[PDB]
Design a protein around this ligand. Structure first.
Ligand SMILES: *[C@@H]1O[C@H](CO)[C@@H](O[C@@H]2O[C@H](CO)[C@@H](O)[C@H](O)[C@H]2NC(C)=O)[C@H](O)[C@H]1NC(C)=O
Ligand SMILES: *[C@@H]1O[C@H](CO)[C@@H](O[C@@H]2O[C@H](CO)[C@@H](O)[C@H](O)[C@H]2NC(C)=O)[C@H](O)[C@H]1NC(C)=O
Ligand SMILES: *[C@@H]1O[C@H](CO)[C@@H](O[C@@H]2O[C@H](CO)[C@@H](O)[C@H](O)[C@H]2NC(C)=O)[C@H](O)[C@H]1NC(C)=O
Ligand SMILES: *[C@@H]1O[C@H](CO)[C@@H](O[C@@H]2O[C@H](CO)[C@@H](O)[C@H](O)[C@H]2NC(C)=O)[C@H](O)[C@H]1NC(C)=O
Ligand SMILES: *[C@@H]1O[C@H](CO)[C@@H](O[C@@H]2O[C@H](CO)[C@@H](O)[C@H](O)[C@H]2NC(C)=O)[C@H](O)[C@H]1NC(C)=O
Ligand SMILES: *[C@@H]1O[C@H](CO)[C@@H](O[C@@H]2O[C@H](CO)[C@@H](O)[C@H](O)[C@H]2NC(C)=O)[C@H](O)[C@H]1NC(C)=O
Ligand SMILES: *[C@@H]1O[C@H](CO)[C@@H](O)[C@H](O)[C@H]1NC(C)=O
Ligand SMILES: *[C@@H]1O[C@H](CO)[C@@H](O)[C@H](O)[C@H]1NC(C)=O
Ligand SMILES: *[C@@H]1O[C@H](CO)[C@@H](O)[C@H](O)[C@H]1NC(C)=O
Ligand SMILES: *[C@@H]1O[C@H](CO)[C@@H](O)[C@H](O)[C@H]1NC(C)=O
Lengths: 117, 408, 95, 97, 48
């Protein structure tokens, strides 16, 4: 006898199609913020873009990378680790490294040391 | 009484815990989307209120950046990443409960695992810049530096030293002689291990130990829930949903009802942002305190009373926790005191003798000079006493005899 | 009252006085000890000698000048009472 | 000058005072009764404003609990209640004040 | 109007309570360090 579902905050999250009785789920349309990553116009005019909390496929359509923060566009993901220059988030940092381009990597917390004990 | 003094004869190594929150969740509520998401007439009326939808976003962005700075300033206090040696013979002390456990995929310690286990209408939640793995890496580096180096790794180049000698230095810093450690090494190691085990058991048993972190999480969740619930209210208009406002009414009445809804929702958003600012200020104060304790208790040995624990501070160990830090303070407490009869000075040959470092005590028949925090009596000698004046000015001087080593 | 009410404090002023009396008694009779473990007794003259020993002054300074130091301390306490009783704007923060 | 020093020959025992507030008065203003004590239409109209009357009470209650915690953490710092001996000969020092 | 007045009062009380909490934390610290021990921090427990 139940037609629609409401959650803990009283927002409808499910409906039963009236003609074929199949339970369906309502998930909000993607929304978020857009951020621009720049190394400063004093050095270059090449920027990267970050779409926060959005899957790369849903972005309307250089190099596309998915991170926990969101979809990064225009930055090449290296496999190394350096000190954080520009903090993107979730352990991901961006920098301007040599031709010459904007790279995205994972943070390095510092040099590895071992005291001779 | 004016001649009785109590001196301890035994000690106890105790470990206490302290929990401090350092950061909170980074939420962000979009202004226009919350007040009215799909409507365009509502947006056009909302533009008439100027920049009430930029100040709120600016405030929330400032709060999020503040949270990241809080975590950064608390945990990132080590320049390098130190590692403990594979051989782990620290003279009897057993740091297994706090050192990282490589078997687990998360590489967290026993106590850290226990701690972590125990604990849209236009709104988004950002992820923290430092993942929990990096927080654990900081805490592990701090622990390895403390165990291997001492306090030297926080004031320059890290210098190795055997842990027994480091404990001897740390006793020497509270007024107890080095020889106390070396003659009771096994007993102290056993007490430390038992205390660490008891800390683990006490944390695991009682669930209401981590009150502050849960309190912060609950407060934030309740605030967000109240905002979402407040989204559906009339505020004097005919209906809360604005589709019925815009479909069943002519432009004038629809406009006035939309204005009423807009005013109510804007007031609610302002209230939420103000309370968030106050809460963020409180959390920043707590994070400043946590950073100070990390600097002074972990990287050094503080003489401030009741700052790093309850007793005479020996050292401290940091552990991570969801949105917070946990300090394990290892302290020294005396026990098994005994009464003694004491005198200010001693008149040997018409000259008053005072102790260099210690105090005069008595079985009841003989006189000895001892420490102040431990009972280690020894014969009175010219080596450990100094002369000043005659035997007439001191009130309470006691006639007795001293010994001179230059009499073989 | 138009709907406004004032709740009483959980601790009465007598209990606060009892706390402060316990603190004073422990400080006078024990010294540092009662705040870092089991309380241990010590004569007050030797406690003051220990406290001079902590600021860089040798113990014999206190013992040879005990009467002068006691008189200075008593005079200072009396002057504190006189000064507090003199000006009514001393307690500006609580007011 | 590069060879002269100044050294004291006497001392003074000085007592100073410092005053610090630790708590305020615990008040709790009722929301609806302040706005309108007896009117019923007023209460019915206020019910359309949602939870603007529970947040205020929650905040004030939090403040009162905080005041009690402030006093408790400032003063309650001894596990036992110590007592001074009936004989009060402390070597010349007078604590009767 | 009356709701606005109540909101203003509550906000001011919250800020004042934060200030008093800071002062009470300072008082607790001074009780721990000056009364229960002897402090080497300059100008903390008096002047001298
Ligand atoms: C509403 O009409 C649809 C279409 O006729 C019905 O769907 C059919 O239901 C029968 C009975 O189970 C199935 O055998 C058919 O395969 C269904 N058609 C399709 C295209 O899937 C539906 O059952 C009707 N529902 C009600 C409540 O009347
Ligand atoms: C100081 O206290 C410790 C306990 O905290 C004493 O060690 C205990 O001694 C008893 C009696 O031999 C044993 O049954 C316990 O197993 C010991 N405990 C530990 C942890 O070793 C110690 O003897 C005391 N010191 C002195 C001088 O008596
Ligand atoms: C340090 O303490 C831990 C915990 O008490 C010891 O680990 C135990 O080791 C025994 C034998 O290897 C096992 O049966 C237990 O299950 C272990 N306990 C835990 C919690 O893992 C460890 O052996 C101690 N270190 C040393 C050097 O003895
Ligand atoms: C006073 O101190 C002395 C020194 O320790 C104690 O005398 C010793 O007592 C033990 C136990 O009988 C003997 O083995 C030693 O030979 C004694 N030493 C000397 C130099 O006589 C004496 O017990 C203490 N007084 C009291 C009341 O305990
Ligand atoms: C140190 O200062 C004290 C106090 O100022 C001096 O004691 C005073 O001495 C004068 C001279 O005899 C007396 O008139 C006062 O009554 C004394 N005051 C007290 C409180 O006793 C003391 O003489 C000074 N010592 C030196 C070496 O200058
Ligand atoms: C400590 O000081 C107080 C006050 O300075 C002394 O109390 C005075 O005692 C005399 C002696 O009879 C009385 O004449 C005064 O009226 C008392 N004053 C007050 C304010 O009560 C007290 O005697 C001093 N302590 C000692 C041991 O003498
Ligand atoms: C970077 O790492 C990924 C993960 O294995 C690997 O597939 C890729 O080939 C690596 N690229 C380089 C240039 O090493
Ligand atoms: C020291 O002597 C007092 C005298 O009454 C006594 O109460 C106390 O218990 C004695 N100390 C110990 C450790 O027994
Ligand atoms: C201790 O006080 C008593 C009086 O109770 C006195 O007879 C004795 O001389 C005093 N001793 C010292 C060392 O002050
Ligand atoms: C100690 O020596 C002084 C001076 O020689 C003397 O007056 C005093 O009586 C002696 N002590 C004892 C206990 O006899």
């Amino acid at each position: 006898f139940q037609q629609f579902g409401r959650d803990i905050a009283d927002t409808t999250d499910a409906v039963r199609d009236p003609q074929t009785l199949e339970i369906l789920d309502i998930t909000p349309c993607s929304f978020g913020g857009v951020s621009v990553i720049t190394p400063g116009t004093n050095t270059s005019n090449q920027v990267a873009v970050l779409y926060q909390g959005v899957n790369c496929t849903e972005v309307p359509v250089s190099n596309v990378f998915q991170t926990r923060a969101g979809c990064l566009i225009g930055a090449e993901h290296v496999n190394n680790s350096y000190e954080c220059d520009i903090p993107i988030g979730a352990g991901i940092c961006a920098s301007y490294q040599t031709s010459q381009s904007i790279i995205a990597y994972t943070m390095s917390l510092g040099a590895e040391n071992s005291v001779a004990y | 009484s004016n001649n009785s003094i109590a001196i301890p004869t035994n000690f106890t190594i105790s470990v206490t815990t302290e929990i401090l929150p350092v950061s909170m969740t980074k939420t962000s509520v979009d202004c226009t989307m919350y007040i009215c998401g799909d409507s365009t007439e509502c947006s056009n009326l909302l533009l008439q209120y100027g920049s009430f939808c930029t100040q709120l976003n600016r405030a929330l962005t400032g709060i999020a950046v503040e949270q990241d700075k809080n975590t950064q300033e608390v945990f990132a206090q080590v320049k390098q990443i130190y590692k403990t040696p594979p051989i782990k013979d620290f003279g009897g002390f057993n740091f297994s409960q706090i050192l990282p456990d490589p078997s687990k995929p998360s590489k967290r310690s026993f106590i850290e695992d226990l701690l972590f286990n125990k604990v849209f209408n236009g709104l988004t939640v950002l992820p923290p810049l430092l993942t929990d793995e990096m927080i654990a890496q900081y805490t592990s580096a701090l622990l390895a530096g403390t165990i291997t180096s001492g306090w030297t790794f926080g004031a320059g180049p890290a210098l190795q030293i055997p842990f027994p000698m480091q404990m001897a230095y740390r006793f020497n810093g509270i007024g107890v002689t080095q020889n106390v450690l070396y003659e009771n090494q096994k007993l102290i190691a056993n007490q430390f291990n038992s205390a660490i085990g008891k800390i683990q058991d006490s944390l695991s048993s009682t669930p209401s130990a981590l009150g502050k972190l849960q309190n912060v999480v609950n407060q934030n969740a309740q605030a967000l829930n109240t905002l979402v619930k407040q989204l559906s209210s009339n505020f004097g208009a005919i209906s809360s949903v604005l589709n019925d406002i815009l479909s069943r009414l002519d432009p004038p009445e629809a406009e006035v009802q939309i204005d009423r809804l807009i005013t109510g929702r804007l007031q609610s958003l302002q209230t939420y942002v103000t309370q968030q600012l106050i809460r963020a200020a409180e959390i920043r104060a707590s994070a400043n305190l946590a950073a100070t304790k990390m600097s002074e208790c972990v990287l050094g040995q503080s003489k401030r009373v009741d700052f790093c624990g309850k007793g005479y501070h020996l050292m401290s160990f940091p552990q991570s926790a969801p949105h917070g830090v946990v300090f394990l303070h290892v302290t020294y407490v005396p026990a098994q005191e005994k009464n003694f009869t004491t005198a200010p000075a001693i008149c040997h040959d018409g000259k008053a003798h005072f102790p260099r470092e210690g105090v005069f005590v008595s079985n009841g028949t003989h006189w000895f000079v001892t420490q102040r925090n431990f009972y280690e009596p020894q014969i009175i000698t010219t080596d450990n006493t100094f002369v000043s004046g005659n035997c007439d000015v001191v009130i309470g001087i006691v006639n007795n005899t001293v010994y001179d080593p230059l009499q073989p």
